Amino acid sequence: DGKLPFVLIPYMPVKRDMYGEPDAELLGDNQAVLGAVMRGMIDLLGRSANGQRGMPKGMLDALNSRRYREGEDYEYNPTQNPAQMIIEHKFPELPQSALTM
Amino acid sequence: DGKLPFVLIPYMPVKRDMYGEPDAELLGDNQAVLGAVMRGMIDLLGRSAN
Amino acid sequence: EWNDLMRIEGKAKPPKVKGRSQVQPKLVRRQAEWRYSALTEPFLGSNKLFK
Prior knowledge:
This is part of a larger assembly, with 3 copies of chain A.
Chain A: H1 28-47, E1 53-54, H2 62-69, E2 87-88, H3 96-100
Antiparallel strand pairs in A: 1-2
């Protein structure tokens, strides 16, 4: 052949240059932005309380409170409705902006 | 044959390397995140009075 | 730097903060995966490689 035995193959050729550009050149910012959104969604769910029960004080007497905790029928003071009480924390709803972004 | 009798077959080949990468390499984080959500749903229902 | 974006090893690595998630989706890797099979397949579609 009489010349160098090496062959150059660029992916995206550069004007009057040897080395081409890979796809990672254009997606540097997009990957970083996408990573921030995903971590934010996990932190919102992960750090949030889940499965914990909150009971207002004075709604149940000493004996009735134990029976409720043991899974039996109980009686409550009518001044406080357990429907709005007995908070059962769950995962907060994900904002629509995070999905849109 | 005059050479080693072993044959190497990679799943996802690595650039200039023998051992390939299985699918478990890319799904390490996804499985852990999915497991956390499933356990949270069960805990909410299981611990709730019914 | 380009190799540090294909895999999360270099500057693209998220900071390690206690009590917060450290995951990072592989946007660059996903694009490359759909390109490997697309380009390798035509060369391996026949027993003869050179005509």
